[PDB]
Design an enzyme around this catalytic site. Structure first.
Site, PDB file in Angstrom:
ATOM      1  N   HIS A 145      64.519  38.682 113.970  1.00 20.33           N
ATOM      2  CA  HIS A 145      65.017  37.462 113.335  1.00 20.33           C
ATOM      3  C   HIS A 145      65.526  36.468 114.375  1.00 20.33           C
ATOM      4  O   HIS A 145      65.026  35.339 114.473  1.00 20.33           O
ATOM      5  CB  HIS A 145      66.109  37.756 112.305  1.00 20.33           C
ATOM      6  CG  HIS A 145      66.516  36.539 111.531  1.00 20.33           C
ATOM      7  ND1 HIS A 145      65.624  35.800 110.780  1.00 20.33           N
ATOM      8  CD2 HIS A 145      67.706  35.899 111.436  1.00 20.33           C
ATOM      9  CE1 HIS A 145      66.254  34.775 110.233  1.00 20.33           C
ATOM     10  NE2 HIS A 145      67.519  34.811 110.616  1.00 20.33           N
ATOM     11  N   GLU A 175      64.090  32.706 115.269  1.00 22.08           N
ATOM     12  CA  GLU A 175      65.082  31.643 115.328  1.00 22.08           C
ATOM     13  C   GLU A 175      65.721  31.473 116.697  1.00 22.08           C
ATOM     14  O   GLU A 175      66.458  30.502 116.899  1.00 22.08           O
ATOM     15  CB  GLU A 175      66.183  31.889 114.278  1.00 22.08           C
ATOM     16  CG  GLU A 175      65.736  31.839 112.802  1.00 22.08           C
ATOM     17  CD  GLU A 175      65.147  30.497 112.365  1.00 22.08           C
ATOM     18  OE1 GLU A 175      65.423  29.465 113.018  1.00 22.08           O
ATOM     19  OE2 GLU A 175      64.431  30.468 111.339  1.00 22.08           O
ATOM     20  N   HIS A 207      61.898  37.013 102.925  1.00 22.00           N
ATOM     21  CA  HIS A 207      61.868  35.899 103.865  1.00 22.00           C
ATOM     22  C   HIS A 207      61.125  36.278 105.144  1.00 22.00           C
ATOM     23  O   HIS A 207      60.328  35.491 105.669  1.00 22.00           O
ATOM     24  CB  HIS A 207      63.292  35.435 104.191  1.00 22.00           C
ATOM     25  CG  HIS A 207      63.337  34.205 105.045  1.00 22.00           C
ATOM     26  ND1 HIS A 207      63.951  34.171 106.278  1.00 22.00           N
ATOM     27  CD2 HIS A 207      62.835  32.964 104.841  1.00 22.00           C
ATOM     28  CE1 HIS A 207      63.830  32.961 106.795  1.00 22.00           C
ATOM     29  NE2 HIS A 207      63.156  32.210 105.942  1.00 22.00           N
TER      30      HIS A 207
HETATM   31 MG   LIG Z   1      65.587  41.435 113.765  1.00 18.94          MG
END
Ligand SMILES: [Mg+2]
Ligand SMILES: [Mg+2]
Ligand SMILES: [Mg+2]
Ligand SMILES: [Mg+2]
Ligand SMILES: [Mg+2]
Length: 261
Positions: A145, A175, A207
């Site tokens: 993420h 991100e 997501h």
């Molecule tokens: Mg992760």
């Protein structure tokens, strides 16, 4: 009598909840006399599940219920990947609980990528999973993420650790850093033209599945295909997209962390 509380952000979707069931089974097999309890820390996910007849306790609810049952020894295990913001909020509700209960001893288990040793073990497990694909000169891209938390360093750190196993194992984040552009630059150096992707996440949440494999213009599948790669998404035998918690040897790392010295 010991009890164990498993802590995750949570999901309302069927595939992640099957992964959660595998994690519960691993802990139950290891400690067959213990109560194993769950909390999902996302308030909104708890609310959506309740609309479905699925009742998950908030963290304070979950621990108080264990206290009211007599337990004086409680294990609270992080099912997170990194010791970041959600790990810190775990500790916070654990301490809010310890304060109200001086006689209850609470043991906390660390997330997956806590130490270099953990990351080597994860790298070896993932190498084993994909060795047949790596053998054909196809790259494996792992999508984390990404966070502004200092624990974001685990993604670059496991990326370097994975180079001891294969140049074809490459980590980025959606991100933060390393980014998808860093992944593309690393891919270019390998000579691969085909890529298999998997989320570097405990479960394949909704997501994350879109970030990875959706038709959106900025999904990783689209961006890698724009670069000229042939892209495949790793799947379980049942057809679901795979995630880290689906692998038994990964589940064992959380298991060991619950009692680590
Ligand atoms: Mg992760
Ligand atoms: Mg995490
Ligand atoms: Mg495997
Ligand atoms: Mg899955
Ligand atoms: Mg599985």
């Amino acid at each position: 009598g010991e009890a164990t509380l498993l802590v995750t952000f949570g999901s309302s979707y069927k595939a992640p909840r099957e992964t959660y069931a595998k994690i519960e089974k691993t802990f139950a097999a290891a400690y067959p006399d213990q109560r194993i309890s769950w909390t999902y820390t996302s308030s909104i996910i708890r609310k959506k599940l309740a609309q479905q007849g699925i009742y998950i306790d908030a963290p304070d609810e979950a621990l108080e219920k264990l206290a009211r049952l007599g337990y004086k020894k409680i294990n609270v295990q992080s099912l997170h990947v990194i010791p970041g913001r959600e790990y810190d909020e775990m500790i916070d509700f654990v301490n809010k609980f310890k304060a109200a209960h001086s006689d209850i001893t609470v043991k906390v288990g660390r997330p997956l990528f806590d130490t270099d040793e953990d990351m080597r073990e994860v790298a070896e497990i993932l190498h084993k999973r994909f060795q047949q694909t790596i053998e054909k000169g196809e790259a494996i891209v792992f999508m984390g993420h990404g966070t502004e938390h200092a624990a974001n360093d685990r993604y670059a750190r496991i990326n370097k650790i994975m180079k001891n196993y294969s140049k074809f194992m490459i980590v980025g984040t959606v991100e933060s850093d390393p980014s998808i552009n860093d992944v593309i630059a690393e891919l270019k150096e390998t000579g691969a033209t085909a890529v298999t992707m998997m989320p570097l996440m405990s479960v394949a949440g909704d997501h994350a599945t879109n970030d990875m494999a959706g038709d959106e213009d900025d999904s990783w599948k689209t961006l890698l295909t724009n670069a000229g790669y042939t892209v495949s998404i790793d799947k379980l035998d049942n057809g679901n997209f795979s995630a880290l918690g689906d692998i038994e040897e990964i589940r064992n790392i959380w298991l060991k962390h619950m009692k680590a010295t």
